[PDB]
């Protein structure tokens, strides 16, 4: 029922190899729908989802200029950040940015986001009130002071509470056949002996959307969290996702183990056993 829109900015400096590269990707939930790359032959916002292609040329032209302007701003930020941390001009650095809004089933704003990271570490983030900032270090305190003086947060809030939610609701409507459809996981359990006294039970979950899912193994009704090998949820390449959990069991005790699957597409949690 809940939905989200996210934009992910990535700027990477490359001393001796040109000016910093700027790339942006836009997501509705777990579905990417737009992209932009400053290293492309002709930098422009490009559609990555069928339901966004219906937007006119004025849509793509306007956003392209926004990305180009943001790219230039990021380069200014990167230069400032080096000075904040007393870094030389020889090292490469990364500025990441992610912002967006979360809405409920009625389309009302639940939560807004606007945060930054420098070289993989959190730098500054707009608080949940969308009025104040949280700085990670004394360098980010400089940014905080500058943005507090310019009342930067007010502009962020106006977008997150207005433009962000309104366009998200529009996107959800235009692609409701996909964005508002939850695909349940296709599940099965495999069995492979590693010896004559032990065997591996692997519980599979395939072809599900969205990516959010819970896979657990239980022995005699007790969670086997520590003894469960759980791989990261992975994309299949067809919008859907994959995941599995495995447990090493003594030979002959396979029926004492049960796999539990929870997903939005499932009305009730599933319980699986081997064969």
């Amino acid at each position: 029922g809940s939905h989200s829109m996210r934009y992910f900015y990535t700027s990477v400096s490359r001393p001796g190899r040109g000016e910093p590269r700027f790339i942006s990707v836009g997501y509705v939930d777990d579905t990417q729908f737009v992209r932009f790359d400053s290293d492309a032959a002709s930098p422009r916002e490009e559609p990555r989802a069928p339901w966004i292609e219906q937007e006119g040329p004025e849509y793509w032209d306007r956003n392209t200029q926004i990305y180009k302007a943001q790219a230039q701003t990021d380069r200014e930020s990167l230069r400032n950040l080096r000075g904040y941390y007393n870094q030389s001009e020889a090292g490469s650095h990364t500025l990441q940015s992610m912002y967006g809004c979360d809405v409920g089933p009625d389309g009302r704003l639940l939560r807004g986001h606007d945060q930054y990271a420098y070289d993989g570490k959190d730098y500054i983030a707009l608080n949940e009130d969308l009025r104040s900032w949280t700085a990670a270090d004394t360098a980010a305190q400089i940014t905080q002071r500058k943005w507090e003086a310019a009342r930067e947060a007010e502009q962020r809030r106006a977008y997150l509470e207005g433009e962000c939610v309104e366009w998200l609701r529009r996107y959800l409507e235009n692609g409701k056949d996909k964005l508002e459809r939850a695909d349940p996981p296709k599940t099965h359990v495999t069995h492979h002996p590693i010896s004559d006294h032990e065997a591996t039970l692997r519980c599979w979950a395939l072809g599900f959307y969205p990516a959010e899912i819970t896979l657990t193994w239980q022995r005699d009704g007790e969670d086997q969290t520590q003894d469960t090998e759980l791989v990261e949820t992975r994309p299949a390449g067809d919008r859907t996702f994959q995941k599995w959990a495995a447990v090493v069991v003594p030979s002959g005790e396979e029926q004492r183990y049960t796999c539990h699957v929870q997903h939005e597409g499932l009305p009730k949690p599933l319980t699986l056993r081997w064969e």
Partner: peptide
């Protein structure tokens, strides 16, 4: 659509 006029860090 993305937000514009975002200030530099």
């Amino acid at each position: 659509r993305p937000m514009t006029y975002k200030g530099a860090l």
